[PDB]
Amino acid sequence: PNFAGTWKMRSSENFDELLKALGVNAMCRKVAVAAASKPHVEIRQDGDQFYIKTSTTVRTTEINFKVGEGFEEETVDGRKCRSLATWENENKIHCTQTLLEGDGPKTYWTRELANDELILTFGADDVVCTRIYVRE
């Protein structure tokens, strides 16, 4: 059971389309595609408490949060937001994001276990990027 373990991305869908929906410029988008191709995720779960390490070739980001408690993070394009995760059900976290400064697209992420795969989705207005992870 559980979200915890080491994950390798098996597939990604609609990354470029999501970034365009976020108002990321063409040059950054074009380049950013290659670099994000093969991320490794380490997740620690203790009930509603999470530590998530996301490693690329270029960078590691580490965040902690609790399901049920407001916290702070960045959007996929690195803009500051307040976040709130709840369990949609036993195997799925939905996390709403609200920008701290100004206006921009409505963003969210979700994480889901299905068939012992981790399905990460990012939303930006009507667009949805889907990243599918398997245990390594």
Add this chain to the structure above:
Amino acid sequence: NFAGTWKMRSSENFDELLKALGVNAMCRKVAVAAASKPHVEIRQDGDQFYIKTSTTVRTTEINFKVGEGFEEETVDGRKCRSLATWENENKIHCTQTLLEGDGPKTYWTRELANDELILTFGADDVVCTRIYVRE
């Protein structure tokens, strides 16, 4: 003479410079990595310069004569008019003037020192330094 083939030996404050230029975190991470291993070809004939800079998925070919305006982009890709002048016999200073919008004052310099090529970028108070050696 600046002419020849150059590889980067070291880079300092690139991330800090991009932050000064209002580049957000994801694009910063990307830009630094992509710029991590540039290959530079310079041809120099007196005041006339060609600078070819090759990164992962970008080549810029920059032509200018010392004393005449030319078009280029800022390090973060905003439209500018540029002007190169000799600060001294081994240093080009290049003033940049933004065409579209308002933003930080930007410049670059290139300098020969102990047969190394030293590229400097400014964005208001921040300074990025990249050091090239002949490859």
